[PDB]
Amino acid sequence: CIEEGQYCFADPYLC
Amino acid sequence: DPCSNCPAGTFCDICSPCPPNSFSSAGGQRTCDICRQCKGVFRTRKECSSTSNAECDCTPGFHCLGAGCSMCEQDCKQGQELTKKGCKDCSFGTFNDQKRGICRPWTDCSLDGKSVLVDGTKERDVVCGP
Ligand SMILES: *CCC(=O)N1CN(C(=O)CC*)CN(C(=O)CC*)C1
Ligand code: NA
Secondary structure: OOOOEOOEEEOOOOO | OHHHHOOOOEOOOOOOEOOOOEEOOOOOOOOOEEOOOOOOOEEEEEOOOOOOOOEEEEOOOEEEEOOOOOEEEEOOOOOEEEEOOEEEEOOOOEEOOOOOOOOEEOOOOOOOOOEEEEOOOOOOOOEEEO
């Protein structure tokens, strides 16, 4: 797992 | 009770169908849920309907993480692993055969009392000879 950022995006509807 | 007949696609308050960009999965609801929207890196796999939520996957170069693809995680190449600073080549000793996940250490054939039949790479594990 990596932090949310330019390499991993979180859909805040889901998250 | 009066409402239990208000069917999926509607809510009760009087069975008004679901507003735009809203859905109701079963009959009897006192409200319709707002549709997920697929923005930025999230692409639309299935459009929202009056009775089913929108579904999202990811644009090419990313891949889905989480229940129902809650996150898009950048791809890397075989022989790399993604980091907080981007795709890094696997360190010697370690391999990744997928465009996701981490470099994993080669198998230790000595441990299981065996020789390395074939040397590993940054994409493939060693193979041991019993
Ligand atoms: C392995 C990633 C992970 O579970 N988390 C990091 N994160 C991200 O958005 C990564 C792209 C936040 N987390 C979520 O589960 C958000 C839906 C935790
Ligand atoms: Na649904």
